[PDB]
């Protein structure tokens, strides 16, 4: 998705505000060329999109688009790569047209796109081009949401941009339901290794596979395992075949991260109900059973890399070693012999990463420190302690150590002689607060991780997976998720439509061998070519029992359930079913952060902002004017003085807190005096 991206801003391109809003609009020439749905929802909407799927490029920087030219009431079969201009010359009706099995058609009066981008019932003689297919105006990601034609573009685009924010789980199961996109997507995705030549397998490994090309020649394929992504996600590659196997060229050989059985996989397939339960599913609040947690169904791998250099100062050359200034021994335990820590060691935030040291220089010691040294026989060690410690909120083992040395002839930047980079992973369980979302834009944070037992559950004792809130559905216009849920329940269940008395009418034009279904068989629907609700109803009527005589769901997609808390059945049947969902790249830990006191500024006197460092939260204009509205002044004064600029007052207040004593008075602000000096130096009599 990052590739195939379209943007007009840049050098030569317009800047953000300089462009009028109209360029953001969806001109009808966009049809079939730029998917009108996929675009960033921030303050760049309309500024950046992507290509329609079947689109293709002019050598002259245009969109050469295929089209099915019709002739003589008969659609030909000659693809016609057309630009937009010539399109205006012509007459194109829709792919969803009652073609008479031969290019011939059915009715005279046919929809068709006008040179003005307009539609009418053309008499069925006039068109000269038909659509190549449905969904010719879709994006890639847009091509991957079933029932898409049933919900609003708003939540549609929401889920669309989110779906690129999925995070690769460790198990990577495929969804029961989908489209035709999920396989072609991966086969262009690349990261899944593809069979180059048709052949019989030679030998595999967890790291590579020896391949027997059909005539003599052979080859290996190095699996990428635990490769740190650009975002700390793992990049394993597991092989999916056997050394005694034989495959063909251009064939899958090992899934990538989000790939299962070759096709895409962005989550799991889960049974959910929709009731409002205990208020915990309040306003997108999303509840979760412990069962997934203890089953690791939501389990992320993260790869944080740390690096530090070996510079050289006027005081000499930086040093890295177990030799340290004043420091414990146990803290110097899991290091190697020569500074850096040992592979495979558990760690926690603040712990030492690499033992590095440099000279600090010389200053008159305090008499006090000199006294402590004297009573303690402790040397000076003027070389300053400059080691590597893990920053806050970090743990997990260290996989690999990347080490660089100028002495090793490692080419390094100037004023450097040794480089090291470290790799820690932490198998993050799913945890509350994290953001999940179906394939509908329907999203939200993790409400609360509830145990398994305390859960509304089936008559078969099968607990539900999660619960969503009905109240977000209508006002968001997202019935497609309900459609998906019904379909997924049907899919998990399996059916066998009794075509004993001919065929039930809805199944009439339905493709064969859908007349039954093995439970948990995989299926898919084209975006615009999807099942009808009547079709789904006829399906749901056919819902063969799981193990016992077990029609768990009504013909209406609901069922009676039991509160694992109450003990009673609920008073009504309830919508349930299997949904596929994703996990977003907005984990709690990525956002959770607080602070009291840390490293003060250099320009100003101010302890560093930025959650990469500590950072913190800026109390500015909105809730000032606000506090004034409240009338409470002292808190605001304290904030703007003793938490803002009072150099002396900061340590004063810190002292006072340490001693348990009444707060000192707020001193003068610093930036105030700075502005004062500025105004002065502007040749301005000030006083």
């Amino acid at each position: 998705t990052h590739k195939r991206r379209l943007s007009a801003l840049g050098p030569g391109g317009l800047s953000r505000e300089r462009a009028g809003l109209e360029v953001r609009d969806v001109h009808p020439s966009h049809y079939g060329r730029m998917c009108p749905i996929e675009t960033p929802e921030g303050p760049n909407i309309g500024l950046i999109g992507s290509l329609s799927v079947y689109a293709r490029v002019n050598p002259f920087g245009f969109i050469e688009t295929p089209y099915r030219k019709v002739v003589d009431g008969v659609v030909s079969d000659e693809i016609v790569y057309l630009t937009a201009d010539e399109e205006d010359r012509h007459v194109v009706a829709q792919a969803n047209s009652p073609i008479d099995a031969d290019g011939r058609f059915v009715e005279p009066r046919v929809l068709v796109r006008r040179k003005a981008g307009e539609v009418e019932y053309v008499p069925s003689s006039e068109v000269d081009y038909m659509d190549v297919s449905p969904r010719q105006m879709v994006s890639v990601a847009t091509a991957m949401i079933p029932f898409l034609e049933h919900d609003d573009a708003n939540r549609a685009l929401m889920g669309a941009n989110m779906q690129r924010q999925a995070v690769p789980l460790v198990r990577s199961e495929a969804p029961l339901v989908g489209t035709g996109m999920e396989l072609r997507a991966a086969i262009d995705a690349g990261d899944v290794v593809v069979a180059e030549e048709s052949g019989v397998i030679e030998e595999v490994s967890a790291d590579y596979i020896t391949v027997m090309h059909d005539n003599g020649t052979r080859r290996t394929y190095r699996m990428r395992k635990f490769a740190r992504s650009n975002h700390g996600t793992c990049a394993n590659q597991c092989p999916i075949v056997d050394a005694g196997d034989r495959v063909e060229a251009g064939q899958v050989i090992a899934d990538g991260p989000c790939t299962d059985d070759g096709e895409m996989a962005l989550g799991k397939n889960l049974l959910v109900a929709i009731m409002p339960w205990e208020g915990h599913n309040y306003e997108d609040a999303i509840i979760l059973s412990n069962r997934l947690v203890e089953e690791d169904v939501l389990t992320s791998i993260h790869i944080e890399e740390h690096e530090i250099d070996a510079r050289d100062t006027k005081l000499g050359a930086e040093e890295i070693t177990r030799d340290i200034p004043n420091i414990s021994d146990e803290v110097l335990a899991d290091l190697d012999e020569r500074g850096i820590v040992r592979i495979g060691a558990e760690v926690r935030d603040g712990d030492i990463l690499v033992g590095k040291v440099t000279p600090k220089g010389e200053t008159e010691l305090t008499p006090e420190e000199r006294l402590l040294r004297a009573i303690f026989g402790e040397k000076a060690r003027e070389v300053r302690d400059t080691s590597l410690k893990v920053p806050h909120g970090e743990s997990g083992k260290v996989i690999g150590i990347r080490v660089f040395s100028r002495e090793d002839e490692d080419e390094l930047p100037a004023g450097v002689n040794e480089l090291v980079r470290v790799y820690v992973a932490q198998k993050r369980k799913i945890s509350d607060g994290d953001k999940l979302a179906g394939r509908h834009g329907n999203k939200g944070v993790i409400g609360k991780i509830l145990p398994v037992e305390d859960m509304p559950f089936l008559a078969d004792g099968t607990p539900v997976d999660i619960i969503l809130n009905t109240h977000g559905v209508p006002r968001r216009m997202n019935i497609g998720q309900i459609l998906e849920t019904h379909l997924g329940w049907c899919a998990h269940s399996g059916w066998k439509v009794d075509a004993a008395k001919g065929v039930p009418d809805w199944a009439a034009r339905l493709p064969d061998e859908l007349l039954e279904a093995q439970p948990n068989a995989i299926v898919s629907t084209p975006v615009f070519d999807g099942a009808q609700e009547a079709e789904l109803q006829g399906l749901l009527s056919c819902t063969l029992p799981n193990r016992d005589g077990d029609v768990l769901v009504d013909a209406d997609g609901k069922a009676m359930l039991f509160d694992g808390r109450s003990g009673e059945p609920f008073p009504y049947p309830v919508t349930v079913g299997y949904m596929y969902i994703m996990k977003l790249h907005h984990l709690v830990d990525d956002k959770i952060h607080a602070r009291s006191t840390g490293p003060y500024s250099m320009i100003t006197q101010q302890p560093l902002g930025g959650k990469a460092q500590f950072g913190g939260q800026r109390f500015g204009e909105m809730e000032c004017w606000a506090m004034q509205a409240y009338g409470a002044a002292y808190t605001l004064q304290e904030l703007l003085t003793i938490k803002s600029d009072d150099t002396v007052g900061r340590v004063k207040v810190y002292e006072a807190i340490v001693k348990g004593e009444n707060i000192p008075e707020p001193g003068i602000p610093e930036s105030f005096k700075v502005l004062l000096k500025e105004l002065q130096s502007l040749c301005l009599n000030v006083e």
């Binding site: 079947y54 072609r184 068989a521 898919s524």
Partner: peptide, 27 residues
């Protein structure tokens, strides 16, 4: 179809498209 390791997913195609997908990275 038309793919060697294609796991069998049945779909609801009521139509039939002449052309298949292009080479997305050809761009």
């Amino acid at each position: 179809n038309s793919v060697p390791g294609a796991p069998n997913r049945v779909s609801f195609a009521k139509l039939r498209e002449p052309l298949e997908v292009p080479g997305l990275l050809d761009v």
